[PDB]
Amino acid sequence: QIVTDNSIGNHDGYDYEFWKDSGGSGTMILNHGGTFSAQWNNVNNILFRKGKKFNETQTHQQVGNMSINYGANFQPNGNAYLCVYGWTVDPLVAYYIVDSWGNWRPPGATPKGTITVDGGTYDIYETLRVNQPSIKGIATFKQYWSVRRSKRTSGTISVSNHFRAWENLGMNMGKMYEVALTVEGYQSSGSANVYSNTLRINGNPLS
Numbered sequence: 042q043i044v045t046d047n048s049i050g051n052h053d054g055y056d057y058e059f060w061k062d063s064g065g066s067g068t069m070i071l072n073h074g075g076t077f078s079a080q081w082n083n084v085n086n087i088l089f090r091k092g093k094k095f096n097e098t099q100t101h102q103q104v105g106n107m108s109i110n111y112g113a114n115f116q117p118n119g120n121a122y123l124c125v126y127g128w129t130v131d132p133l134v135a136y137y138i139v140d141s142w143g144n145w146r147p148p149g150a151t152p153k154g155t156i157t158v159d160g161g162t163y164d165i166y167e168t169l170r171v172n173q174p175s176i177k178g179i180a181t182f183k184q185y186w187s188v189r190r191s192k193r194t195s196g197t198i199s200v201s202n203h204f205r206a207w208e209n210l211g212m213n214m215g216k217m218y219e220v221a222l223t224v225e226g227y228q229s230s231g232s233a234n235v236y237s238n239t240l241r242i243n244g245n246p247l248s
């Protein structure tokens with residue numbers, strides 16, 4: 042179940058992915074269902090996640106209602122995000138629903154709006170990545186952000202509610218590539234134990 046370099050597969054029903062650029066190290070341990078632990082040290086950029094990868098044919102509306110139940114013991118030692126992350130293609134977009142963070146609340150841009158959902162209020166942002174790594178190679182793509190105003194590390198994230206808020210604000214989404222409970226570390230060290238993580242699509246826990 043121990044993963045310490047770039048790897049994409051399926052484990053216990055969930056699509057897991059370990060990704061880092063060069064520098065420092067990380068360890069991901071694949072636990073039951075959507076659960077996993079992560080540890081990272083002196084990295085530049087590292088991401089650990091479990092959720093679902095899609096075959097790039099369906100809008101989020103066609104996939105259906107997405108909802109994630111999670112619980113994490115999150116102990117970043119610097120910059121890091123506890124979130125729901127994923128991709129669409131055509132257009133190519135990386136997205137983030139951030140529930141907790143380390144020392145710096147991302148993503149440093151000007152808010153475009155808010156959505157009040159799952160007991161909290163989130164600021165909505167849109168940023169741009171120029172010739173950076175992506176699921177399609179070195180590319181230029183927008184990132185979409187919902188970042189909670191106060192930290193939390195457990196509860197329900199109503200993914201489709203953020204996707205509708207973004208498209209309401211003019212932040213359009215393509216065909217789904219992935220949705221996943223994600224721990225991301227940036228220029229830092231730390232650990233996180235995701236002890237609970239269930240993805241529901243139209244009410245049914247993933248299969």
Ligand SMILES: O[C@@H]1[C@@H](O)[C@H](O[C@@H]2CO[C@@H](O[C@@H]3CO[C@H](O)[C@H](O)[C@H]3O)[C@H](O)[C@H]2O)OC[C@H]1O
Nearest residue numbers: 047049058060086088135170173174175176177
């Ligand atoms: O083999 C390919 C993998 O290498 C590829 O990995 C993706 C690379 O890009 C990552 O995203 C970047 C870093 O994290 C934030 O989104 C940054 O802002 C993005 O630049 C993806 O997380 C990795 O999954 O994916 C496709 C696989 O075929």
